[PDB]
Design an enzyme around this catalytic site. Structure first.
Site, short mmCIF file in Angstrom:
data_model
loop_
_atom_site.label_atom_id
_atom_site.label_comp_id
_atom_site.label_asym_id
_atom_site.label_seq_id
_atom_site.Cartn_x
_atom_site.Cartn_y
_atom_site.Cartn_z
N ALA A 1 0.85 -1.07 -0.04
CA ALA A 1 -0.02 0.01 0.17
C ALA A 1 0.93 1.30 0.12
O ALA A 1 0.53 2.26 -0.60
CB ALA A 1 -0.83 -0.05 1.06
N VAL B 1 -5.07 -3.40 4.67
CA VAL B 1 -4.11 -2.85 5.82
C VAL B 1 -4.59 -3.44 7.01
O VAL B 1 -5.60 -2.91 7.31
CB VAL B 1 -3.62 -1.37 5.49
CG1 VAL B 1 -2.74 -0.96 6.55
CG2 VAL B 1 -3.50 -0.86 4.17
N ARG C 1 3.09 -1.89 14.69
CA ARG C 1 2.03 -0.91 14.75
C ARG C 1 1.76 -0.45 13.18
O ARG C 1 2.96 -0.27 12.38
CB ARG C 1 2.29 0.61 15.36
CG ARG C 1 2.05 0.43 16.74
CD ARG C 1 2.41 1.68 17.41
NE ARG C 1 1.31 2.63 17.11
CZ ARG C 1 0.89 3.56 17.97
NH1 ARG C 1 1.70 4.16 19.05
NH2 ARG C 1 -0.07 4.52 17.72
N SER D 1 -10.53 5.53 -3.12
CA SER D 1 -10.21 4.87 -1.99
C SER D 1 -10.78 3.54 -1.61
O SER D 1 -11.91 3.69 -1.05
CB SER D 1 -9.78 5.63 -0.73
OG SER D 1 -9.25 4.74 0.50
#
Lengths: 114, 114
Positions: free
Chosen positions: A12, A37, A44, A69
């Site tokens: 990504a 994702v 993290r 998106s």
């Protein structure tokens, strides 16, 4: 009447630059970025997602080309069998929604462009 | 010189009652409970862990028989290959620590019992 071209990227994080490169050549009325994702439980993941969303918005504002998106971050994904099937099924609905949104936004921009 | 007897239960929620039942028969200087309580990403898991720890403490205080706790809750466990090996290796260290603790606590209780 509408042609779709597919481009592959490793992750990504590589999407905003590819979108900017493709947008500056004309040839495309819209750009769609799709990625999954997730939180792997070790590192993290919010930094990369925030950077990708912000970069897509920045490219959209820079090149005056709409960018849709489909980069989605689930609340929980533990790679179990139950989790896999649910999102495997839900991404179809997400794709249909993205197609409708792209058509509508292209038509609206064409209309307001007089 | 020390003999260990193994008892099987379906889940961690079944441990306090089994420990209480075994404690009232005498025959045992200590009781060890081992479980792996993780967050599956679908349902909240802290209620069961809290109940199990509190119940083990309550049984310990009720029956005057030490109860060692090897009921562990990791911060993250996503059933990946990397996660499996780490805890598979760490539980050996946990077992050795539990054995040392059990021996020491039994000896100390024998000492203070005059």
């Amino acid at each position: 009447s509408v042609e779709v071209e597919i481009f592959d990227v490793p992750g990504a994080y590589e999407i905003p630059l590819h979108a900017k490169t493709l947008a500056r050549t004309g040839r495309y009325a819209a750009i769609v970025g799709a990625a999954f994702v997730i939180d792997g439980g070790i590192y993290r993941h919010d930094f990369v997602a925030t950077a990708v969303i912000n970069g897509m918005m920045q490219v959209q504002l820079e090149t005056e080309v709409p960018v849709l998106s489909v980069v989605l971050t689930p609340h929980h994904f533990h790679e179990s069998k139950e989790h896999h099937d649910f999102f495997h099924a839900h991404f179809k609905v997400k794709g249909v929604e993205a197609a409708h949104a792209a058509l509508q936004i292209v038509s609206e921009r064409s209309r307001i462009a007089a």
